[model samples]
Target: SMFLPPPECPVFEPSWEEFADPFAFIHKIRPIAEQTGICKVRPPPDWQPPFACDVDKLHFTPRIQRLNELEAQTRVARDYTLRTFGEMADAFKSDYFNMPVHMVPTELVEKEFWRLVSTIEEDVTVEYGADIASKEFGSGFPVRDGKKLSPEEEEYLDSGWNLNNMPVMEQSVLAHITADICGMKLPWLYVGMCFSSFCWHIEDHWSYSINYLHWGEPKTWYGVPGYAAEQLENVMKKLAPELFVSQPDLLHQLVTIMNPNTLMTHEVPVYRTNQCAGEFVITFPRAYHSGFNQGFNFAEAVNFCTVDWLPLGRQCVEHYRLLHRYCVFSHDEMICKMASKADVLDVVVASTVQKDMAIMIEDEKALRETVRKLGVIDSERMDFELLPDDERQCVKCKTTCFMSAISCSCKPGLLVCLHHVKELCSCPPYKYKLRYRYTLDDLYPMMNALKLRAE
Candidate 1:
């Protein structure tokens, strides 16, 4: 049998009624979209947001991606003007295939890509889509190496979508996360050439992700539903076992592409799509997606979570603990932060946050009681948030510590999460001190406020 395309994912063209509120439309379609792992959402004709940016003056660093399956790409930054970068992309593609831009079918590249990767005789490397491509470059700062971008560039940052200048009103969950968890909330603009692709991956902590093709030839995508996540991981672990090993040194990592056909042969369900200009792709929590551009394209993407994602967020944190993976943020801290701001939260969001808080308080009290029995008796209130992100992380698990941590002077300011107290340096039980943000009594009132807002 020859190569085969996976099932086409469902695409929805939301009516004005359904499209009026972005979040509401999402919640409405989530039941189906969540089932599929990813779905394409097309807005009504009048719904396009004007993409105004000057590209030629704009500058950015391009990341190089290797064609090797499962191998990490180089972030070796290189400078380019939006115009020059686009020319490079176009020239690279036209020169490689020796064909007119429109003559190349997306499927031809798809099949040839499979051939190139499967055969050991070939070694072709592609680039990760470069960021910021245009005649009127809008991305902030040139690669002029630390020279302050003039006020003209400064205005561009404010003009394009920075997390700080988000448009109004929706259940856009990441918008409410008060803490500035770096990189998670920001939008990434990518200008991709032929064969430029992103590898298979999921959003951090099982959050939902959305990518908008601002204007582009075509971006092909392959997505594996969240339900099939572990299956895909299992197949990946068997082939590239290093990916499963604990990454003590973050710099040494792997990020190579594996075909959807490989996953399908392993019996994992896969879906495909060719996203065009003005279309949006929404990937459900834990869905693994990757794809390449057929020619030239521009896209913007960001990740966010919603009320329905609360349980999975908690699950992902616990999963992180099991693997000794460093978490991006303390799940408990985010829960509590939202709880404290319950008065301003959406009623449904308040309701969901309250449930998670109840579970958190009950679990925290038990953790404290168990630690108390372990004789970590001395305690003091400590403000964990005042410190930098890395400073507050649990030494063993690298989890961002928020509510409480167990520390010992023998370790000299180092702390372990309650679950990892025994793994901390060889100090006697009494030598360990429980540094807590809130007493057990103080926590109930916080959960109560979220409950009050929910009702």
Candidate 2:
């Protein structure tokens, strides 16, 4: 079932006390996490995690290279990224491979294509639990011209058109890279993901390197090839063992061992931070991580890893290439399959769930009051004495024979009828067909679109 409308989600800090041992987890889960082809193996000890370490000592200044400036190399970069997605997409199941890179709106790339080439050179001292409080986050930039914005501006902001939507600012050069690739201009903004209380768990598909921090301040992350990946894999194995079990036939063997390139026990360190920036050029593939940020007021960010990807060494590529093997997949397949296999022992607890009738009546009254405020209905015209010819029958009743003693409102009590209510408020035939069309429209757009034309 769909979740209740989201409320402000809560956040917390885990105990920072060190684990009993650095390899406390690996030592514990090694037996189960390790697998050959069907399961994942841990990366070698020095294997770097998905991202590069933040360079605290040095700050990277924004380098905006104009598209025209690098016109000669534009086609090569586009072709490379596109071809990579194409080849990889083809190998996956048809349904899982539907995200066509070309359809990724060019506007997104032009708008969010830069990484923070530099960092804040000033030495910063960051405090944790000692003083954690909420405060205003980013500058609500681009205020509606003069005397505040009109209603249209408010709607635009609601559609993600405001500067304050991001925690901090990005250097313009980043825009140029995406503009060149997307072949259009896009609004400048952060990529990756945001630690926003309002948003839920969403993953950013763009290629990136994330350097996450804790307590709202930039922290350091060194790329140690093997250690981190395996740490996370272990958690997945234990928590989502069935996820590791089911794989396309040929790769089944690879899933059974503790292969870093395949799958393995793993864990990711969580750093709580309220800062606008973090270091980590997390290759987009391995960058598929979910976050629960609640350290500061609205101060979290998807601080993009703005650097170019092609120049990165093969080690990074090899690491992500393997991670991407699963990243591109729709987890729903295994999720549905696993969920279906679980023993179906429906233990129905004895209980009665009923709606509060009093509140329900109040709700109906509220709806009526709202419509009454609109003044759309004319009392004289709406009353039964002068009812419209089309509504002579109870507007709610379907076909029915006249009863020998017709129940009249003159008696003053609410009453039920023998027959079911007519589907009069709606065009039953159209709405029923419309609902089915919408379901198909989501998964089979080409055919659905043609069907709509036929309709």
Candidate 3:
């Protein structure tokens, strides 16, 4: 038996109803993992192969002391993560009128969206983020219906990321929960993409998920448990054909029909996963989760999670609370030894990208233009082989210190690798003075807003 919770935590308390369902809620998630992994991986065109790199003290060579300077410099370098749903729309949405979740007018999304709403309102922004009024800027969200903004709302706005117009708070909480349970670390943001009757699978890197249906019903399925383990053993087992047929009619069925009895009637409802305007779901790391494109309205959701390696001495539940407070959303930094600070021309050749056709269809070839100069993560799996041997060592320590650190008594056995200090300088959050910066320009405004100061 597992450890029981105290009287204070009623959530962990057991009941006969809860104890009986072993497959319980687990089976409902089976289709998502199985189908997504086996099929639906259409890598973005011009998406650079995500390689890994080692970072040392030298990479932190540029000292940043103030928030403004950091913001400005980060904008220049474009080394930042994106949140704020509006940003997602401007950056990822290829056509002005087409919303990611629903091709319908933006008004529908806004009408359904309730900002800073508490329990009374379906979409609650309070628990997930600081109120728009509290922050210096990024309030007053602009609701889009097709290409037009709300005349009433648009007239008064200077600039802000309107939380009032976004989806609910449960999305962030679920993201927080998933990251905590899985022990992943990396900064993250909540994003939702609406496709026309087609589902997508993102390969490389694990993600936490939360979905809330606004206009359309989401008829979906997930993979069986231990799929990652099973995938390793079997060779020809495929998912798209069996799970999501990708046909126009099938896509609708995959997303719309939720009742199990409606489908063949033989399968009983063992588990259920749901996300409405107020309701949402938090998925554990199973194998792969897939969504079928169903009608004009695919599932609209707030996709937020981090990719950080968990630290030691952390309980799963408490860890989620900590991650919610500090890990996923909060931003902080520290000083450590760095090795290399060099202006190395980083470019991604067209050939290296994986299969990402879904992104291409969404953006309509516009996504490729943004890929001239980008950062690459050089880890054990995907090394940044493009870089010459001379530049291969720690960006902070450089090749010299790493070689020295290997033997030096001060840093012996440290195995000091690149992830420590070397980080890919991302595109700036604000627009660069120069014409035409890297591809992901929507991120610049925030990146430029970071505080930066040199020592």
Candidate 4:
């Protein structure tokens, strides 16, 4: 338990008719509760979806974890009941790990966390349900995939929370069905027993995340609003600089718990919730959140975007550049993909894409002119699509390049943006090849194309 109380986040109970259009309904709630960062949605009492899954038939190996210890030996094991798990981890920190639990300053806990993890023989055992991509176990939400369903199941599938229903919303980012990681679609399933903690973090690429407690015991959450993302980051950096040091992969970086009281003490807004079965929690872009399960539970969550998210998506990429963080996907690629498919997009989406495309084109023009003045020749256009995603990204900023880039003969295949030309390498501007994905003549049509589609 935390030493300080967390502020209550917003909770909304909407009627079925009011939530007929999930996207619109969510947007409608933004002004009222967006500052809270996380929202709990409880559908009408009678509106319960049918949940059918055989626990015995569904088997998975869970990765064992020993919290409060550094470099603890890891071993995989089968799932255990809540009672068995509580006995294992209940005292791992206080007794076995020999940690002070009372009002212990956060910095001390953070310092001890790294210290414990630095040693290999602390000897503590902990286990929880596996966190697997939803594709492994088909989503409980009924999606239309040409499969026959019982009448009851069919009705439930049509509900707003159904994964299939998300895509049809106007200007929705999650509608991009092709967007995937590890062959997994958006929704990720969480299988949890007592004290299975998800450490402090934000969603990948700074996008929105929706989590549904499909059927579960309460999962506790603490959230910091998106606007205060930087404030919390600064606090963390001051207390735990070790976490910010560059790592080979961002996904494997060390994550640990910090108390909400610590954040509030530093003037960051914080909120908390205890989400039970049948409730939904939505986290806004860049909202820092962390939580753990109280008992055995199954939850499903997914990341998504909408037209409203485009600007924040752009801002997030710039933020990543500043932090030298690895990005999950190219923000420009997603924008250009939407532009290329403008005709099929909702009119509102097409309009928004066109506006962002215009900005991209203007920024590209300025960069190209700047490079030309510096003696970088504008040569052949590179079919960025023909190359791998990694090849198309700027090494300095990690931005997906569709406009102009400076390539060095010294470091073949590596490229940098005009903003980072001097930082690219020792090669002079003349020796650097100017690679571009499109010319003004070519890009104008794409922007115009979206306008025509919108009209």
Candidate 5:
């Protein structure tokens, strides 16, 4: 009983007009695509952007991975040179089937990949590369840095879909962040060998992710819609409770390969697709996705949030707090940051952010009042952003504090959000002081600014 790929995910072949504005095209298709969790988008025939890079000169260290299902693994794992990596990856696939690399069918590889991982006697392992684009090796997409660009590169330099430029685009929510959150905002280059896989996981902060294959073999993907994310997790928990065990930090959170059929048998709707070179795959917010390389392949991907995701982003942060999981950034902080510059913000984004802020202010108001009643009377205005990311986290919940936090003189570096006031320290309530970035008087005006901009 080897793997049987799930039904294909929805595919859209956009006309040049629809594809011209990537964000608009995405929103137009959101209703359908989000239903399936992931979708394959085929660009107009003449839309190719040149992929320029030397395979021999480009190099990275490879992380070794064994073919074991539900084996806990970290996502940010290691490297190899493009040429050497290709040779080893090509040879690995070729020798395994005893055939020329091109002769092997992608379906066969997918089948064998699942079979190998499940077989007790087989201990197959592969290596792959993943890292943020850097000077040593840059993005497959054109970037406006270092070298003077050629005519081919300059043509697509301004394209909204360019992975290099996508993150900072105005329509995307992560753009305004002055904070250096490179891992979430920058494009990541992935070099895959045969059988190399990524475990089921959602984008950080429940943001949407888009991946474009630069070249080489097809990548097989399995996805579960955002609505079924918890259902899929329930099934995974039954088989590998170890992953559910509370992780000490974000990096320690376990990700593992699991059979899509296993999830389907449990009644979780699953979808599949083979993302070939020149194609794009988009995973929606909270969608659960995992996949493996058919052979040697290269791709670039980045995470982004849209106006439609503003509400979900806030919900995700609350979910993280309940689980004591670390947040990538304060959602409320991002909303306020955009609200501060509402004059320059997109009208739809301003409207969306306005509603989220309305709720945040009310919640902040209540939290402050409750903490004050608990005898946290000493109050001071402090810039939460000025502190390093680690310095701002609530000691109990690991949330990156922004609006307000409770601090005690006895615990020099420790702090707690209002929700966890008692968890901060055993010190008497009178010893506790409230550190706030802004007062209600200051916050109400920020929301009004957004409201005026939207109007």
Candidate 6:
């Protein structure tokens, strides 16, 4: 690992006075926390939400794990669950895998992690919870999901850390409003027993993740700052080449536990947290984190983005393109969607969106001009928004079209990017339509309008 280690994860214990404006507090803390990958928030003593679930009634299918085995060999990918993930721990007590439940201590778990990772053949058995409990058991936090909330629940719903209360988030102007890859809106529940683990990985789209230990024994976490995301990748790839070698995408790569001591030995700045019930851990964008439970516990987590994350969203797509990874959604499409509806966007957010949109427009203009010079005739612009999402994409690159796209009369609805104009059809360039979201004349005014609104 050639990358220098950054500082350790920061911890905060804010008073209710300081937490009054949660987003404001978050904004103030960003400069500091952004430099570190993770932070722990100890809520003011009076700010506790009740554990509402009837633990005995809950059930979920547990993912089976093998100690010292590569994640690719052991991950049980499925969801279902209830009596809480905590109550479900009883099932792991039997000598089901011939590994005694109590004998597998934290030290042994840590030892097995590196051993399994270092050697291809060593393996041990364990199980962890990776089920969709928010949909099945409802969110542990009091969110306004059309349910009749008790007075206490209503109070919790208005709290700053409450997912529903995040600013610019509920307004449909932010990417988080539309970025629903699976249940992005719902919190994912994790049930952990001794030695059960989560692999080292960043949040989807490099968005922030907030995790709450609703109740249980401490769950230990080791995190590397966002700046070291690529550095950690290089280290992991060097140590476990099989995990990334010829993998179709990053998602398919089986990540494993590595001791913080091992990571620090390589000079990667690593921080540890033993989060207990009622404690919260917040991970910044692109922070690489992994950990396991000390014993049986239940936790909830979710992903979100702010205006600050807009540029990063754009950067993430470019990174994805460089890696040739499949995207959950088009970054350009989201930017244009926000631009088209700028009137409704928060002024501050409109400012950020416009900045990114300007970059998109400039990039598109250069691309179109280059293609036209190469003999791809420019046809009448189509109202791109009038077409269905499926139709408004470059068939060649799978990019969701907004600013401009090249389509051919020979194959209606099929489009290619300006870069792929030659791939449109065998028919001549005159038969092609350079479908676009806006004319160059119209785009300038749109940006101006956004600037006026933002000011």
In TM-score terms, which candidate is top?
A: 5
Between candidates 1 and 6, the one scoring higher on TM-score is 1
Structural similarity to truth (TM-score) of each candidate: 0.90, 0.22, 0.25, 0.84, 0.97, 0.83
Q: Residue-wise lDDT of candidate 4 within 1-455, one digit each (tens)? A: 32556778999998878767667878888875579788888878987787776554565556665654212122224554434443444444356336443333433433344344445565434456645444445566766667647877787777667754554444566455344443123566777655566777888777777888887557788898899998998998888777777655455566666767788989999998888899989999899998766545778777778778888888887787776666666666667777778778888888888888888888778988888988887477786656665776678767656556788878988878677888788767888888877778878888887999889
Whole-model Cα lDDT of every candidate shown, in order: 0.76, 0.24, 0.24, 0.70, 0.90, 0.69
lDDT of 2 by residue, 1-455 (tens): 11111111112111222222212322233233222101112222332212222223212111122211001111001211222322323332123225443343322322222111112232211111111111111121233344455664454343221223322222211222211222112222221111111110112223332222322222111121223445555654674465454333222322211111122113243221122232212213222232222222111123222222212212342343344322222111212221222232111100000111122224334543443353323221112212222223322321111110012232322211122222223223222110011121222333223233333
Candidate 2 wrong stretches, greater than 4 Å: 1-140, 143-174, 177-227, 242-270, 274-303, 308-455
Better of 4 and 5 by TM-score: 5
- Per-residue alpha-carbon lDDT of candidate 3 for residues 291-320, written as tens digits (9 for 90 to 100): 221222223233332211111111221332
Worst 10 residues of 3 by lDDT: 332-341
Sort by TM-score, top down from the best: 5, 1, 4, 6, 3, 2
The window of 10 residues in a row where model 5 has the poorest summed lDDT is: 72-81
Residue pairs that clash (backbone atoms under 3 angstroms), model 6: 55-83, 57-83, 58-82, 58-83, 59-81, 59-82, 60-81, 67-124, 68-116
For all candidates, what are the clash counts?
11, 68, 98, 3, 6, 9
TM-score result, candidate 2: 0.22
Question: Which 10 residues in a row give candidate 6 its minimum summed lDDT?
Answer: 167-176
Give the better candidate number (1 or 2) by lDDT. 1
Question: Which is better, 2 or 6, measured by lDDT?
Answer: 6
Candidate 5, residue 354: the lDDT equals: 91
Instruction: Give the number of the best model, judged by lDDT.
Output: 5
lDDT of 5 by residue, 1-455 (tens): 66768999999999989998889999999999999999999998888998989988898878888889888887444456789889888998889999998889888988888888888799988898888889678899876766667775686899888988889898998999888889999999999988999999999999999999989999899998999999998999999999988888888889899989899889999999999999999999999999999889999999998999988999999999999999888887788899899899988889999999999999999999898888888989989988987999989889999999999889898889889999987888889989999999999899898989889
List all candidate RMSDs to the true structure: 5.0, 27.1, 24.1, 5.7, 1.6, 4.4
